[PDB]
Amino acid sequence: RCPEQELRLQRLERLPELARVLRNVFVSERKPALTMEVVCARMVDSCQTALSPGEMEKHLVLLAELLPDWLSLHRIRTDTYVKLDKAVDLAGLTARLAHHVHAEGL
């Protein structure tokens, strides 16, 4: 197993917990979208993670790639807005995330 892939597996292992942290940040926010910068700052501050905000951004992007029906990113000028589809349950998402990760077979 090569380094790039070991790194991906490292990141993928964090996602279920990070997804919950993300959802909680949005539950506490009245606004429907937040900039990536803000979201990353709130996520790193919301748990005991070993990640920098830059590394957190990388994980959020992975999440957006794995769960595009839940997590959308929209560039407006130099900001990137993060929006959650709140019409989906973290339970359903969590099962889908697990399935996707497993299906990669590493």
Domain ranges, ordered by start, for the chain: 1-106
Q: Which two tokens stand for residue 29?
A: 């926010």
- Tell me if 63 sits within 8 A of 15, measured CB to CB: yes
User: What resolution in Å is listed for this PDB structure?
Assistant: 1.9
Sheet holding 33-35, edge to edge: 33-35, 79-84, 71-76
Alpha carbon 19 to chain centroid, angstroms: 5
Question: Is the domain 1-106 a CATH 1.10.10.1420 member?
Answer: yes
Method: X-ray
Q: Which letter does DSSP use for residue 30 in this model?
A: S
User: In sequence order, what are the residues at sequence separation of 6 or more whose Cβ sits closer than 8 angstroms to the Cβ of residue 31?
Assistant: none
- CA 4 – CA 21 distance, rounded (Å): 25
Based on its alpha-carbon atoms, the radius of gyration of the chain, rounded to whole angstroms, reads: 14
Closest CA to 18 of 80, 64, 81: 64
Q: Are strands 33-35 and 71-76 parallel, antiparallel or unpaired?
A: unpaired
